[PDB]
Amino acid sequence: PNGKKRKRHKMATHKRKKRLKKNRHKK
Amino acid sequence: MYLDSAKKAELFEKYGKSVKDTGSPESQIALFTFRIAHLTEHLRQNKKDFATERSLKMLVGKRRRMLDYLIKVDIERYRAIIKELGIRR
RNA sequence: ACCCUUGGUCAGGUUGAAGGUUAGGUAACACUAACUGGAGGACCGAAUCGGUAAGCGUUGAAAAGCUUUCGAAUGAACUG
RNA sequence: GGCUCCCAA
RNA sequence: AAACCAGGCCCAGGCGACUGUUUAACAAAAACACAAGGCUAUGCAAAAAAGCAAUUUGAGGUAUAUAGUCUGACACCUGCCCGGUGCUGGUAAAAGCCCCAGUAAACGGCGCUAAGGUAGCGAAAUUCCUUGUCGGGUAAGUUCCGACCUGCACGAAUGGUGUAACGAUCUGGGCACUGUCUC
RNA sequence: ACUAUAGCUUUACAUUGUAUUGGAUACUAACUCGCGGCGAGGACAGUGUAUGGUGGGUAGUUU
RNA sequence: UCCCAUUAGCUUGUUGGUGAGGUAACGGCUCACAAGGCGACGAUGGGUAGGGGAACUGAGAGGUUUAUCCCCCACACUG
RNA sequence: GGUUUAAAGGGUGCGUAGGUUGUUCGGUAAGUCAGCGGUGAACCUGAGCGCUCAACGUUCAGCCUGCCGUUGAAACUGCCGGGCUUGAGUUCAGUGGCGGCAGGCGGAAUUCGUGGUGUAGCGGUGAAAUGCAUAGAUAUCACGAGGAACUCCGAUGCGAAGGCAGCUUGCCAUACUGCGACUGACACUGAAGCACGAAGGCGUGGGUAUCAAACAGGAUUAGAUACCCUGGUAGUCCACGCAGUAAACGAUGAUUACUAGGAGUUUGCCAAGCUUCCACAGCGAAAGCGUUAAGUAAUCCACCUGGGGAG
RNA sequence: AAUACGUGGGCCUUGUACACACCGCCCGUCAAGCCAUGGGAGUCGGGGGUACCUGAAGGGCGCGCACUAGGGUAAACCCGGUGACUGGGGCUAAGUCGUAACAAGGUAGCCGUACCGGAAGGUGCGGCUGGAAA
Ligand SMILES: [K+]
Ligand SMILES: [K+]
Ligand SMILES: [K+]
Ligand SMILES: [K+]
Ligand SMILES: [Mg+2]
Ligand SMILES: [Mg+2]
Ligand SMILES: [Mg+2]
Ligand SMILES: [Mg+2]
Ligand SMILES: [Mg+2]
Ligand SMILES: [Mg+2]
Ligand SMILES: [Mg+2]
Ligand SMILES: [Mg+2]
Ligand SMILES: [Mg+2]
Ligand SMILES: [Mg+2]
Ligand SMILES: [Mg+2]
Ligand SMILES: [Mg+2]
Ligand SMILES: [Mg+2]
Ligand SMILES: [Mg+2]
Ligand SMILES: [Mg+2]
Ligand SMILES: [Mg+2]
Ligand SMILES: [Mg+2]
Ligand SMILES: [Mg+2]
Ligand SMILES: [Mg+2]
Ligand SMILES: [Mg+2]
Ligand SMILES: [Mg+2]
Ligand code: NA
Ligand code: NA
């Protein structure tokens, strides 16, 4: 219950989802 | 499951010695099979009754465990009861 | 050219959809394997319809053809 | 000839 | 396989899903059609089409129907603009017009403005310069394939980008084979 | 592009009448439609004359 | 008597029988009916390694390696 | 050695293999126990002897504490046969529920259209503007149409979990308590596997009122791709089919037995069966848990082994 | 002389990712410098497998026939390398743009999912307290 622990995971999820949304529609 | 005391008594008289023997493995297996068939008939109309499903599955599990007990105790009785009920499928 | 009514024609071979039966399987349907079945603007290919490519012909045998080659060939087929 | 299957009936 | 008879095959691109249709007599195709999608019109003497009319088609069908029009299997999708032009609403003895509002899978546009091109593609059936540059293939490649992006002058139903199967289509490279050639 | 025009559309007169309360409502008998007289509408609609819009659908021409 | 299931099915002399041949010797070892055999108690495949006693190490359990020493196996440029 | 919060309980069940098995009688001898026998260089351990000592060399006593064979024992586990009723299940009765599926019915509110009255604004904000309005809004009355959600009760209760709330009916399922009934260990857990599984999302067809991603406009700001305001499309609703995720949480897996007090509370008769808060022993690093344990113990499953890279 | 007295410091409680103590810590993109590693038209190797065709010696079988090492061919698999171009990640400094989180961090935070933005992020729907205030 610090908060930074969840902030790091939130950052990683943001980056991964941005990568996937950029890669969609391109083949 | 159109199940009432009269039907239960008829089943217990048919399977197992005396009509007061409600606890015999044969009587329990017969009762389980009867309500399994009736619940199947209910489900084919109420296809979305997921609570009546898994209640059907728990009944099937109970019947299987009683049959396994009959295997462990007296095999001839198990052959007789499955022949008289047409269970194996 | 298109339509309407009434008729006719399409050698032979191949593939193997739906469906069905039999075994297993399920609470019951589903689902797996074998046998069967014989669908399709399906396949190969005569008749037939068309006209790809090349050669020939160009006061031609013919005011549009011939030979070889090639497309379709149960269909939106061809034909009286 | 009938039979089977099919729908475009 | 005994003669006659009797598929050449493989790798990789563009276009069009496919079977069909077409310029009788120089073009068979990437053109037309297509199954399918959208929009619009039409309540039934329907709208619509022929006819001076009668009458007929639509159809003896009835909104899961009929007609007009664009797109063209399928997959992922289909951005912004209603300013202009269309369309829809609120004189003789009222319409209109105005004004306001709406409509882009309507025509059209995407440089002071109505909005100043989203995704995806890109020297492309589109690129003038131009045989652009780099990589591959060849001894050597103005064609071909893969990339790059200052796109003269791509771009989302006059559809965008892909796509298995199909093609007497266009285009590049191999093997087989040979009088196409050295001759 | 100029000028016409088929078609479509607006209004007036005719077809076309009655009553109430004019500007609307109501009526039935003109007229229209349906079923085999009855039903549904109704002085509207449709049609004729005139008139204003619209009209590359069609025509004659100019450039 | 080592790891990998990001290796789940493997097997046709393969499992058994009859007979024959062959071998120092039994045997599908080889050759002329039946369909069996092995498999989550890990078959098959892939990777890695010679194996033990020693030795070292730790209170012990255990762990590391087999340099010298001893035992067994494999090999002698490659088949 | 651990798993509430440091890494660590699977979203929840059912269930295959496997693991574990109430009480009692009698066998058997697989596990277990005991006796006897065989087998198991050098090095390593006490005692010597020789290296002038020592390393070292060597001899002898003490290790064989593994494997194999053969004789006995029967307490426990296993296997076989029989018995019991406490566990478990079936029956009967009582009571209870927002438990599931399906069909019908209802009122308040909101939106749109039509008509009547009426005219200078309504709406919105910290303040405004966009917006709607004399081609007649807001407001008010009536007619008509359609979709969605169920105020008060209402914080408790039910369900394996996700979840479940207008009324009513039909068809199901199930919990709890007792029985003077029945069977007689028939049990627990459970790798695979199967089923169910909020919201959002996808396909086909209906429906489309409110709200509202994207988007458009107006503001606030140095800018505002936001917070605020006005519009607005998917979606939100229904049927069928996919998908399989969550702070799917009690961040606490399931069974069984045992171990203090207080304060409330639901249900059928003091007492179960629940559902909530302080709090002994004990546990814990502490915060804290404490009969609904995170205490005392047994069985089985899941998971962890410094952080990032990296789900 | 005039004039009204009502609107930055201390105590208690609470939260904290601050302890040089909010003139605090701190994320993310773009730009810069080193390191490791993905995708890619193609292209170059290494040994093994399957099938076919040839095929030594030495036995066997009836001056020839099987058996076979080795050779050629094709494939397909596995293991490696390189490649125009094109993507993440780690580490070091700090150039640039902001302020997302930590206090109710100035719009409570976080989980899942969807759409959208130069970036931290924003918004919708459901959930949680690991939130104040009430
Ligand atoms: K003929
Ligand atoms: K080209
Ligand atoms: K026991
Ligand atoms: K929840
Ligand atoms: Mg984000
Ligand atoms: Mg054909
Ligand atoms: Mg012919
Ligand atoms: Mg043919
Ligand atoms: Mg074509
Ligand atoms: Mg063709
Ligand atoms: Mg021609
Ligand atoms: Mg021609
Ligand atoms: Mg077209
Ligand atoms: Mg096209
Ligand atoms: Mg050339
Ligand atoms: Mg190119
Ligand atoms: Mg267009
Ligand atoms: Mg003209
Ligand atoms: Mg003239
Ligand atoms: Mg943790
Ligand atoms: Mg849980
Ligand atoms: Mg978890
Ligand atoms: Mg902030
Ligand atoms: Mg904040
Ligand atoms: Mg937004
Ligand atoms: Na050739
Ligand atoms: Na939907």
Side-chain angles (χ1 to χ4, degrees), chain A residues 1-26, chain B residues 3-9 11-12 14-16 18-19 21-44 46-71 73-75 77-82 85-88:
Chain A
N2 195 293
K4 307 198 299 217
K5 288 194 299 188
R6 250 175 221 287
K7 290 302 288 193
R8 305 195 257 270
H9 291 100
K10 191 191 213 333
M11 217 39 249
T13 318
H14 168 71
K15 309 270 100 183
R16 189 199 328 127
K17 293 200 181 214
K18 218 191 198 305
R19 270 193 263 298
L20 293 161
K21 114 198 181 193
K22 266 47 183 51
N23 282 350
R24 228 211 281 200
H25 284 81
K26 274 217 274 300
Chain B
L3 191 52
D4 39 344
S5 310
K7 260 310 316 303
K8 289 202 214 187
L11 278 164
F12 297 152
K14 281 199 28 44
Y15 306 90
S18 146
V19 82
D21 183 342
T22 76
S24 211
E26 278 93 1
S27 319
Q28 288 177 37
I29 284 160
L31 176 63
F32 292 157
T33 312
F34 172 78
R35 52 186 325 216
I36 276 164
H38 263 250
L39 283 186
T40 302
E41 194 41 284
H42 171 90
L43 278 179
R44 275 202 263 92
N46 294 143
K47 204 86 55 53
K48 291 269 138 172
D49 212 329
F50 300 139
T52 303
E53 316 236 32
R54 102 177 266 277
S55 266
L56 186 41
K57 300 293 299 190
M58 269 153 135
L59 276 177
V60 165
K62 284 164 105 149
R63 192 183 63 181
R64 165 66 29 220
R65 268 179 262 122
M66 266 303 159
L67 285 167
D68 297 346
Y69 174 68
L70 264 207
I71 289 329
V73 159
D74 203 5
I75 171 64
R77 293 216 271 141
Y78 158 100
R79 312 241 182 61
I81 192 60
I82 80 147
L85 284 169
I87 282 150
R88 225 54 178 83

